[PDB]
Design a protein around this ligand. Structure first.
Ligand SMILES: C=CCCn1cc(-c2cccc(C(=O)N3CCOCC3)c2)c2cc[nH]c2c1=O
Length: 134
């Protein structure tokens, strides 16, 4: 059963091959350094970036497309808050989100099945642990 590794492989390749390849997406590649953007963390209370999402994928944080997309959306929402809805930074963040949604559709059937199977295995392992404890 390599379902979690296969799921994470798909998400990681969307991040590196598609999202990070959006032109001029460098502002979103790494966490903001306050030495470079002094007021950032005075405004943004739930920061996010693509390197952090990759570290999360490597730790198998995401078991669903919805949970992965929550962090992807946090990047867009943070740019709307910090830069404004019309800023070029926000237009770039919107392109990152849209390429993410478009690339995920290429794996719709497979990701649907992987999410179901990961869930089934999680539930069965939980029941086994509960029974072993009693
Ligand atoms: C992840 C979301 C943050 C996206 N973002 C990034 C920067 C910006 C501009 C210059 C340097 C940096 C910066 O700290 N760097 C470089 C990238 O590598 C990490 C160190 C960030 C910025 C400036 C005004 N608005 C934004 C902004 O919304």
């Amino acid at each position: 059963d390599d379902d979690q590794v296969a799921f994470s492989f798909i998400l990681d390749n969307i991040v590196t091959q598609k999202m990070m390849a959006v032109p001029d997406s460098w502002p979103f590649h790494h966490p903001v350094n306050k030495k470079f953007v002094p007021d950032y963390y005075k405004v943004i209370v739930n920061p996010m970036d693509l390197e952090t999402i990759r570290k999360n994928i490597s730790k198998h944080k995401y078991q669903s497309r919805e949970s992965f997309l929550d962090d992807v959306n946090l990047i867009l929402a943070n740019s709307v808050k910090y830069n404004g809805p019309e800023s070029q930074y926000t237009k770039t963040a919107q392109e990152i989100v849209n390429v993410c949604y478009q690339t995920l559709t290429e794996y719709d059937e497979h990701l649907t099945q992987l999410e179901k199977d990961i869930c089934t295995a999680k539930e069965a392992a939980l029941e086994e642990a509960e029974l072993e404890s009693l």
